[PDB]
Amino acid sequence: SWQSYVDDHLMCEVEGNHLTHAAIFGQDGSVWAQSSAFPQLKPAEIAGINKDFEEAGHLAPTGLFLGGEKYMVVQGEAGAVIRGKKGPGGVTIKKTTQALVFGIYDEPMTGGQCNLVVERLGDYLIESGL
Numbered sequence: 001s002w003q004s005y006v007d008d009h010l011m012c013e014v015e016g017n018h019l020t021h022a023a024i025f026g027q028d029g030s031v032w033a034q035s036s037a038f039p040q041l042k043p044a045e046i047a048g049i050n051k052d053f054e055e056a057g058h059l060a061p062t063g064l065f066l067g068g069e070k071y072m073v074v075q076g077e078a079g080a081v082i083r084g085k086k087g088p089g090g091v092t093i094k095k096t097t098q099a100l101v102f103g104i105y106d107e108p109m110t111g112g113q114c115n116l117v118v119e120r121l122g123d124y125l126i127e128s129g130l
Contacts, residue, residue: 001033002024002032002033003033005024005033005121006022006023006024006033006034006035007035009117009120009121010022010024010035010101010103010117010118010121011035012117014113014116014117015113016108017105017108017109017113018109019035019103019104019105019109019114019117020037020089020104020105020106020109021034021035021037021038021039021102021103021104022034022035022038022101022102022103022104022117022118023035023038023101023102024099024100024101024102025041025046025099025100025102026098026099026100027050027095027098027099027100029041029043029046032099034102038102038104039066039067039068039069039104040067041066041067042065042067042068044065045065045066045067046100048064048065049064049082049093049100050100052064052082053079053080053082053095054079056076056078056079056082059073059082060073063084064082064084064091066084066091066102066104069086070086071084071085071086071090071091072084072085072086073085074090074111077119079095080094080095080122081093081094081095081115081119081122082094082095083111083115085111087107088106088107089104089105089106089107089109090104090105090111090114091103091104091105091114092105092111092114092115092118092119093118094118094119094121094122094123095122096122096125096126096130097125097126097129097130098125098129098130099125099130101118101119101121101122101125102118103115103117103118
């Protein structure tokens, strides 16, 4: 179940903290499963997401946009991870073979605890073909 992947493995608490929002998108833009309040993502936002996984740095100018709200781009894993920052929160976008794993965190959480749950689940999905 894609929903339990969101709830039990992207929204799991680590030291009392959990991601604000989490979602698993198919690379075709379609939501596979998301947290209740995950923002809706404009189709251009997912294109800019996808082209940045091709050759990084496409999103670094202009920044990374998700649901209209902008995140300033920060260092990632080229072709595997996109990371962004907005004040005391940010986002991790881990690309699997078929999907896009999203984690959005706020001020109690760290970028580190975000990359933990996001890139974890992602790396596991790649190993099972997803």
